[PDB]
Design a protein around this nucleic acid. Structure first.
Ligand code: MG
Ligand code: MG
Ligand code: MG
Ligand code: MG
Ligand code: MG
Ligand code: MG
Lengths: 125, 25, 129, 81, 206, 96, 87, 217, 97
RNA sequence: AGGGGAUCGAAGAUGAUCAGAUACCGUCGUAGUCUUAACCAUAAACUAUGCCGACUAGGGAUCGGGUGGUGUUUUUUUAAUGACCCACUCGGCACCUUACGAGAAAUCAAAGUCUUUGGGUUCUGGGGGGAGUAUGGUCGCAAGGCUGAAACUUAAAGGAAUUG
C-alpha cells in the first residue's frame, strides 16, 4: 500500500525534465543531490522523492516515459522529426515515371486535360 | 384495492340489489 | 385528399423559406395560386416564378429572395365587409406599416391596401409579411 | 444543396426518377417493330404488352407477358419505335 | 477573379494523384456529392482533384487574409495529422493544436490554453468535432479536410481529400502551407516548386 | 385540421357542439339546472331569517383542536334546518 | 427606419446572411463572417481589401455553408468551375 | 484595475471600440463585464425576485438562494441573469455580472406614423421559456406598458413606453416569464421588415482592422 | 412514463404473436417478449471428455453435442442473471456481448 | 344444445408452510380448455398516439414489384429462367444520428410546418372523489353491455424530472 502522493510524483515531474543530464540511477547519490537542488521540508519526504525520481531513471532508461520530457529528449525527438526521405516521396520512380491509376482517374486527367504519364489496371466486383 | 376489485365488489352489490328489488316488483 | 391547392402551395413555400431554400416547386398550381403569387411578387416578397405546363394541372417553381416571413391562407374564405377589413388586418399582420391581407374580391385578387382605395370587399384569401 | 435549378434538371437525374415524379411525367415504355422469323411482315408490339401478341405466319407466339416488360420469343428481331 | 498562374499545374497534379488523394470514401453524403467525379467498381469513389486544388487555393486566400499568422489554429487529433500540423505551424505563424484539444480552449477565457483565433483549420471534422463545436460558440470560421463520408456541420470551407491515407493528409497540409506562403512575400518565386520536400509532412514511425 | 370543422356552412355543428360541452362547466350547469333555486337552504337568496333551535359546539377539523360554537337554526321561509356560525370572540351568549 | 424629418432612428442595421438574407442578430454566436483575400497579379494578398461573406449560424448548423461558399465564390469569380447550378 | 484577457476587452480598454452597437453589429461575444460598463456606463440595475432552492442530502436540506437581476437603461439595452449562490448578497453580485454579459439591443418602432422618436415596438414578437409564452404587441402612444409588474419593469429598463402583452402557461413562474419576455424583446431585431430589405456593404469587424493593437505580446 | 420504444417486446405489425412457456417457471410470455438463449453444450463435458476418450472404442470418435433453445420470462431471466438490468442509456445497447 | 373430452385446470379435495394460510408450494380434479349450431360484444381491444392530403434532414438494412449492368452462379465446357451482387425506383414493417422544429419533460420525423395561432373532417375532456353509482330507457336467456345523473364531500388529486 505504498502508493505515492501526487506531491511526490509532481515533484519528480518538476525535477527530471530540468536536470536529467546530471542525475544518476543511484538513489544514494540522488538523495544527496536532492539536498541542495531541491529545497524540501522533511527528510522522509526527501527520501520518498529521491526514490521515485530514481525509479523514473530506470523507466526513462528503458525508453521514453510519457508525461515527462527532459530538455535533451526534445532535441532527440526533433532530429528524428526532421527526417526527409530523399527518394520514394511520391516523386514517381515507381515504374520509372509512369504512375498507375484506374479508368476513372485516367478520364479525370482528361476532364482537366493536363499532360501526365499514366496507366490503367482492370478491376471487378 | 384495485378498481377491478371495486368493479367486482360493486357488480355483486349491484346484483344482490336487483334480486332484493325483485321481491317487491 | 386535397381541398385547398392554395393552402398547399403557400405551405410549401413557407417550409422552403424556413429551410433557407432559394426556390420551391409547387403542384398543381391553379390560377388562384398564380394570382396570389403575383400580388406577393408585386410587393417584392418573392422573385420570378415560372409555370411548367404539364397537360394535367400545372406546376410552378417560385424563386424566393429570402424576404418572406410567413405566407399563409385563411380558410374558410370568410365573407369580409369593407368595414371588417381592419379587424382582419390587426389580427393577421405584425404591424400597420407593412404586411398585406390578400382578398379575393369582385375586382380580382388584391391586397387589403389596394382594395381599400378601390373600395371593394370580398372574401379573405390569405396574408403575407 | 439549398440552391438548385429545378427547371433544368440533369438528364441523368431525371432518368433516375419515377416516371410520375419527373419534371413533366411521361412514359418510359416504348413500341417495338418486331419481325417474324419467317415472314417479313412487321408487327408493332408494345414493350409492356401484357397480352400474348400474335403475328400471322408465327401464329403461335410473338411475345410473352410478364410482370413488367414483355418477353420476346427468343427468335424475333426488333427495332425501337 | 484569379490570374492564370493559379491554375492546377501539372507538376502539382503529378503528386496530388500520387498520394491517392483522389481515393474517396465508399459512403458519400448529400453535402459532398459535387466532388464525386465517378464511382469505381468495388465501390470506391473518386474525387475531382480539380475541385480539391481549387478549394485548396480558396482556403489559402482565406488563410492569408488574417492580419496575424499567430491566430490561425491548425487542429489535429488523429496521429497522421500530428506531423502535418506541426510543420504547417513551423513555416507560418499558425499556432497548432496536435493531440488533445482540451475542451473549452475557445470559451473559458481563464485557462492557460485559451485562444482567440480568427480561423480554425481541422484535419478531420469527425475526429475534431470537439474543436468544431467549440468553435461554433465564438464566431470562428472552420476549414476542414473533409472526405466523402465526413460531416459538413459548421464547415465553411471543405477540401475533399483522403482522410484514410497518411500520404494524402500530409500532402494537403503541405500544399496549403505552400500556397499561403506564395500568397505573401515569403515564396515570391511562384513558378518553381517549393524547395522543401512534401514528405516531411507525412507520418513518422516509430 | 386540428379537431373542429372550419367550413362556412358548419355553424350548426360548431354551436351544437359548444352547447353540449358547456354542461361540463359546474357554474353553467348549476344555473341551467337551477339547483340553487330548487335544492339549497336559501332559495337562491343572499340572506334568510330563521329560528334558533339549539346551541352547538362543534370540533374544528384537524389540525386546529378548537371549538367553533355554532347554532342550529330553523329557516322561516322553507323550514330547512341549518347550522350557522357565530363569528366573534364570544357572541354565542348573545344568540340565546 | 426613419422618422418624420428623416434622420434615421435605429440602433444599428444588422448584417444579413450572404446565402439567405437572414438577419444576423447580436446573440448569433454561430454566425461567421469569412474574409477572402483580394489578389492582384503574381498572387499578392495585398492586405487591407477583401471580398467578404457573412454566413448565418443557421446555414452553418444545417451544414450547407460549404456549398453556400462554393456558390457565392463561384458567383464572384473566386472559384472557377467547382459549383454547378444544375444538379 | 482591469486587465483585458480577451481581444474584445483589449480593444475596448484601449478605446478602439467606442460604442456597444459595434459589438452587436458583428455579434462579438462579450465575456468581461468591464466591456459592458465601459460602453454602457449608466446601466441601472434591479432585482425582481429572490427565492430559495433546496437540495436534499444525508443530513438535512441544503439551501441556496437564486437571484434574478435585470440590467439596462431606458435607451434600448436589456440584460437578464440567473445566478444561485450560498448567500443572497453574493447571488446579487454575480447576478448583476451575468445580466451585463447578456445585454442585447432591442428595436423601437412606431405603432402608427413615424412622428417623433420611436415609442413602441416595431413588430409584434413572442418569446417562450418553459411553458410560459409572452407576446408583445405594438401599442399607440400613451398606452403605457400594459404588462404584469415584472415584465412591465423589464420593459421600462428597455426604453419602451407603449406595448401590449399577452401570456400563456404558468406565468407565476417568474424566471420563465422573465426569460420568455427577454427572448421576445430580443427577437425584435430578429424579425425582417421592408425597411431593412436594402443591401449593405457588410463592414469589416473591429477585431480585424484593429488587430495590431489587440492581442499584444 | 414509456420506459422503452419497443415497449417490452418486439412487435410492430402484428397485434398478437403467440405465447410461449418459460422453461424455469412455466409462465406464458409472448414469443417476441421472451428472453431467448441458445444452449450449445458438448454431450459429455470439458472435464470428463478426456476420460470418455480414453475409454472409448473407435479411437477417433467425433464428440456429439446437445442443443436446446431456452425461453425465459422477464423475472426468471433477471433472477438467473441472464439480463442484468442496465442504465438508462446502456439499455439501448442491443449488442450480444 | 349436441359432440368430444388427451393435457392443463376458476370451483372443490388434500399435503405441507405459517401464529394463522379457506394463498403462494405439491398431488388429484368438476366446469372450462376443442368442435358444430346459436348467444354476448367486453380487454392495458395499446403505438395508451383517429382518418384523408401536402411539405420539411442524413444514412444503412429489410419485405414485395418493376427497370438497367457487355456483373457472379450452375446441369449441355455458354444460353433464357432461378439464386446472388451493384445502381435506381414504387409501396410496406421498422431502425439509426441530429435538432432544424416541438414539448412540462420523458421524448417525437412527427407528438414538426402553433400567439408569425385557419388544408378537410369525426369522436372525446373540463380539479379530485361520490361514480361509470342511483334511477329511467334499450339490448341480452343470463352474465351483464350501451346511455347515465344528483345530493354530499373535498385543496388538492395528478404528470415529468432532480437530490436524498
Ligand atoms: Mg416504473
Ligand atoms: Mg392485442
Ligand atoms: Mg384506448
Ligand atoms: Mg410490410
Ligand atoms: Mg372546469
Ligand atoms: Mg369531476
Amino acid at each position: 500500500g505504498r502508493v505515492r502522493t501526487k506531491t511526490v510524483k509532481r515533484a519528480s515531474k518538476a525535477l527530471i525534465e530540468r536536470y536529467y543530464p546530471k542525475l544518476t540511477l543511484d538513489f544514494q547519490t540522488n538523495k544527496r543531490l536532492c539536498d541542495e537542488i531541491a529545497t524540501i521540508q522533511s527528510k522522509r519526504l526527501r527520501n520518498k522523492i529521491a526514490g521515485y525520481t530514481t525509479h523514473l531513471m530506470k523507466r526513462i532508461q528503458k525508453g521514453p516515459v510519457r508525461g515527462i520530457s527532459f530538455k535533451l529528449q526534445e532535441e532527440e525527438r526533433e532530429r528524428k522529426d526532421q527526417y526527409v526521405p530523399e527518394v520514394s516521396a511520391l516523386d514517381l520512380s515507381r515504374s520509372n515515371g509512369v504512375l498507375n491509376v484506374d479508368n476513372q482517374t485516367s478520364d479525370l486527367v482528361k476532364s482537366l486535360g493536363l499532360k501526365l504519364p499514366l496507366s490503367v489496371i482492370n478491376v471487378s466486383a | 384495492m384495485r378498481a377491478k376489485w371495486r368493479k367486482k365488489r360493486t357488480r355483486r352489490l349491484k346484483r344482490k340489489r336487483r334480486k332484493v328489488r325483485a321481491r317487491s316488483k | 385528399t386535397r381541398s385547398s391547392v392554395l393552402a398547399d402551395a403557400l405551405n410549401a413555400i413557407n417550409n422552403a423559406e424556413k429551410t433557407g431554400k432559394r426556390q420551391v416547386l409547387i403542384r398543381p398550381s391553379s390560377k388562384v395560386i398564380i394570382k396570389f403569387l403575383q400580388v406577393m411578387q408585386k410587393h417584392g416578397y418573392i422573385g420570378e416564378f415560372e409555370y411548367i405546363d404539364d397537360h394535367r394541372s400545372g406546376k410552378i417553381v417560385v424563386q424566393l429572395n429570402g424576404r418572406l416571413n410567413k405566407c399563409g391562407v385563411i380558410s374558410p374564405r370568410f365573407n369580409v365587409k369593407i368595414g371588417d377589413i381592419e379587424k382582419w388586418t390587426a389580427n393577421l399582420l405584425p404591424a400597420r406599416q407593412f404586411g398585406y391581407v390578400i382578398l379575393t374580391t369582385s375586382a380580382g385578387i388584391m391586397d387589403h391596401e389596394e382594395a381599400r382605395r378601390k373600395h371593394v370587399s370580398g372574401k379573405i384569401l390569405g396574408f403575407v409579411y | 444543396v439549398l440552391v438548385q435549378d429545378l427547371l433544368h434538371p440533369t438528364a441523368a437525374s431525371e432518368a433516375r426518377k419515377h416516371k410520375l415524379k419527373t419534371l413533366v411525367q411521361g412514359p418510359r415504355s416504348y413500341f417495338l417493330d418486331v419481325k417474324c422469323p419467317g415472314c417479313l411482315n412487321i408487327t408493332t408490339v408494345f414493350s409492356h404488352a401484357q397480352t400474348a401478341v400474335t403475328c400471322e405466319s408465327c401464329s403461335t407466339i410473338l411475345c410473352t407477358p410478364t410482370g413488367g416488360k414483355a418477353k420476346l420469343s427468343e427468335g424475333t428481331s426488333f427495332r425501337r419505335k | 477573379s484569379l490570374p492564370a498562374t493559379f491554375d492546377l499545374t501539372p507538376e502539382d497534379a503529378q503528386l496530388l494523384l500520387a498520394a491517392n488523394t483522389h481515393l474517396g470514401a465508399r459512403n458519400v453524403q448529400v453535402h459532398q456529392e459535387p466532388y464525386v467525379f465517378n464511382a469505381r467498381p468495388d465501390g470506391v469513389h473518386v474525387i475531382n482533384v480539380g475541385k480539391t486544388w481549387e478549394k485548396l487555393v480558396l482556403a489559402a486566400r482565406i488563410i492569408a487574409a488574417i492580419p496575424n499568422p499567430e491566430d490561425v489554429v491548425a487542429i489535429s487529433s488523429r496521429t497522421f495529422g500530428q506531423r502535418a500540423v506541426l510543420k504547417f505551424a513551423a513555416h507560418t505563424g499558425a499556432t497548432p493544436i496536435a493531440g488533445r484539444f482540451t475542451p473549452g480552449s475557445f470559451t473559458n477565457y481563464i485557462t492557460r490554453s485559451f485562444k482567440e483565433p480568427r480561423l480554425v483549420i481541422v484535419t478531420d471534422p469527425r475526429s475534431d468535432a470537439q474543436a468544431i463545436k467549440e468553435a461554433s460558440y465564438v464566431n470562428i470560421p472552420v476549414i476542414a479536410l473533409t472526405d466523402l463520408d465526413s460531416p459538413s456541420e459548421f464547415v465553411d470551407v471543405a477540401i475533399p481529400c483522403n482522410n484514410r491515407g497518411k500520404h494524402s493528409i500530409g500532402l494537403i497540409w503541405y500544399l496549403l502551407a505552400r500556397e499561403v506562403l506564395r500568397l505573401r512575400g515569403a515564396l515570391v518565386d511562384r513558378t518553381q516548386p517549393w524547395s522543401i520536400m512534401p514528405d516531411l509532412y507525412f507520418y513518422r514511425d516509430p | 385540421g386540428k379537431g373542429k370543422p372550419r367550413g362556412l356552412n358548419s355553424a350548426r355543428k360548431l354551436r351544437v357542439h359548444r352547447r353540449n360541452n358547456r354542461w361540463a362547466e359546474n357554474n353553467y350547469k348549476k344555473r341551467l339546472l337551477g339547483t340553487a333555486f330548487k335544492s339549497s337552504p336559501f332559495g337562491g337568496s343572499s340572506h334568510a331569517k330563521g329560528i334558533v333551535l339549539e346551541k352547538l359546539g362543534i370540533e374544528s377539523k384537524q389540525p386546529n383542536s378548537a371549538i367553533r360554537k355554532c347554532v342550529r337554526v330553523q329557516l322561516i321561509k322553507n323550514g330547512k334546518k341549518v347550522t350557522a356560525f357565530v363569528p366573534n370572540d364570544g357572541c354565542l351568549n348573545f344568540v340565546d | 427606419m426613419e422618422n418624420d424629418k428623416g434622420q434615421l432612428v435605429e440602433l444599428y442595421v444588422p448584417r444579413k446572411c450572404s446565402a439567405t438574407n437572414r438577419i444576423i442578430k447580436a446573440d448569433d454566436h454561430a454566425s461567421v463572417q469569412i474574409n477572402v483575400a483580394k489578389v492582384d497579379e503574381e498572387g499578392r494578398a495585398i492586405p487591407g481589401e477583401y471580398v467578404t461573406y457573412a454566413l448565418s449560424g443557421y446555414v452553418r448548423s444545417r451544414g450547407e455553408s460549404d456549398d453556400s461558399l462554393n456558390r457565392l465564390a463561384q458567383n464572384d469569380g473566386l472559384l472557377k468551375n467547382v459549383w454547378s447550378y444544375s444538379r | 484595475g482591469w486587465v483585458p484577457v480577451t481581444k474584445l476587452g483589449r480593444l475596448v480598454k484601449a478605446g478602439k471600440i467606442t460604442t456597444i452597437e459595434e459589438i452587436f453589429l458583428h455579434s462579438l461575444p462579450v465575456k468581461e463585464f468591464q466591456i459592458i460598463d465601459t460602453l454602457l456606463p449608466g446601466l441601472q440595475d434591479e432585482v425582481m425576485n429572490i427565492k430559495p432552492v433546496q437540495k436534499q442530502t444525508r443530513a438535512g436540506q441544503r439551501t441556496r438562494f437564486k437571484a434574478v437581476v435585470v440590467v439596462g437603461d431606458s435607451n434600448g439595452h436589456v440584460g437578464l441573469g440567473i445566478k444561485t449562490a450560498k448567500e443572497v448578497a453574493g447571488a446579487i453580485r454575480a447576478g448583476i455580472i451575468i445580466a451585463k454579459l447578456s445585454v442585447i439591443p432591442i428595436r423601437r418602432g412606431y405603432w402608427g406614423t413615424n412622428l417623433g422618436q420611436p415609442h413602441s415596438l416595431a413588430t409584434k414578437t413572442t418569446g417562450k421559456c418553459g411553458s410560459v409564452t409572452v407576446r408583445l404587441i405594438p401599442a399607440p402612444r400613451g398606452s403605457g406598458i400594459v404588462a404584469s409588474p415584472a415584465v412591465k419593469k423589464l420593459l421600462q429598463l428597455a426604453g419602451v413606453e407603449d406595448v401590449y402583452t399577452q401570456s400563456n402557461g404558468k406565468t407565476r413562474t417568474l424566471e420563465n416569464t422573465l426569460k420568455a419576455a427577454f427572448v421576445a424583446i430580443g427577437n425584435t431585431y430578429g424579425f425582417l421588415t421592408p425597411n431593412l430589405w436594402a443591401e449593405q456593404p457588410l463592414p469589416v469587424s473591429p477585431l480585424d482592422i484593429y488587430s495590431d493593437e489587440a492581442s499584444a505580446q | 412514463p414509456k420506459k422503452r420504444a419497443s415497449n417490452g417486446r418486439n412487435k410492430k405489425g402484428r397485434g398478437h404473436v403467440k405465447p410461449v412457456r418459460c422453461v424455469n417457471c412455466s409462465k406464458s410470455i409472448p414469443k417476441d417478449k421472451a428472453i431467448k438463449r441458445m444452449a450449445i453444450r458438448n454431450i459429455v463435458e470439458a472435464a470428463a471428455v478426456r476420460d470418455l476418450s480414453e475409454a472409448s472404442v473407435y479411437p477417433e470418435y467425433a464428440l456429439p453435442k446437445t442443443y436446446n433453445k431456452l425461453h425465459y420470462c422477464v423475472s426468471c431471466a433477471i433472477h438467473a442473471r441472464i439480463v442484468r438490468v442496465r442504465s438508462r442509456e446502456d439499455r439501448k445497447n442491443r449488442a450480444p456481448p
